C-alpha cells in the first residue's frame with residue numbers, strides 16, 4: 001500500500017505545467033508504468049468519485065480501449081496525488097518523432113491522424129473533453145504502431161454549453177478563444193486536430209502568434225496533397241460551425257483506405 005512498496009521508481013520522463021512524471025515498474029508483475037505527481041496547491045480543477053478532476057476524467061476513459069494511456073491506480077499524499085499510468089515500451093512521443101523525421105509521409109500521417117480521431121471519439125463517448133490535443137500529448141507504441149493520448153490535466157467533462165476557461169496550449173487554441181474567451185468542446189477539438197494534422201504533414205505548427213490564428217490563412221511550407229490541404233483548411237475554419245464533425249473528417253476523401261496500426265509499424269516504424 002505504500003507507493004514505495006508496490007513500485008520501483010526509475011528516472012524522470014518530464015516535468016512542467018502538468019507536474020512531474022517518472023518511469024517505474026510494478027513490483028507484483030514487473031509491468032512497466034509511469035508515475036505522475038501533481039501538487040495539490042497546483043490543482044485548480046477538482047471533482048469527486050475528493051480528487052483532482054484529472055483522476056475523474058481518467059477513470060472515465062480508462063475502461064480498456066487502447067487509444068488512451070490508462071490510469072491503473074492512484075494515491076493521495078498530504079500535499080500531492082500520485083497517478084500510476086500505463087507505459088508502452090519502446091515508446092516515443094509524437095513531438096520527438098516528428099522532430100526526428102521531419103514532415104511525415106501522408107500514408108503515415110493518415111494512419112496516425114485516424115488513430116487520434118478514434119481516441120478523441122472514445123474520450124467524447126465517455127463524457128470527457130481532453131482540451132490539449134497536440135504532438136507532445138500523443139505517444140507512439142512503436143512495436144504495435146498504436147497511438148495513445150496522455151495528459152488529461154487540462155480536460156473537462158464534455159458538455160454542450162460554452163466553455164469560458166482554458167488552460168491547454170495556446171497555439172492549438174481556436175480563434176473564438178483568442179477573440180472572445182469562449183468555445184464549444186467539439187468544434188474547439190476539431191480546430192486543434194487541424195493544427196495537429198498540419199504539424200504532421202509539414203513538420204511544424206501553422207500559426208505562432210494570435211494574429212495569425214485569428215486571420216486563419218493557412219500557408220503550406222511543404223508539399224501536401226490537395227485533399228490533405230482541403231481537410232486541414234476545413235478543420236481550421238474560422239467560424240466554429242463551419243468546421244467538420246468527426247464523422248465528416250473520417251468520411252473525407254483524404255481519410256480513405258487507412259493502414260491498420262500493425263501494418264503501419266511494419267511499413268514505417270520497423
Ligand SMILES: O=C(Nc1cnccc1O[C@H]1CCNC1)c1csc(-c2c(F)cccc2F)n1
Pocket residue numbers: 013014015018021033034036069085086087088091092093136139150151152153
Ligand atoms: O501519462 C503519460 N505521460 C504524461 C501524463 N501527463 C502529463 C505529462 C505526461 O508526460 C510527460 C512526460 C513526457 N512528456 C510529458 C505517460 C505514460 S508513459 C509516458 C512516456 C514514456 F513512457 C516515455 C516517454 C515519454 C512519455 F511520455 N508518458
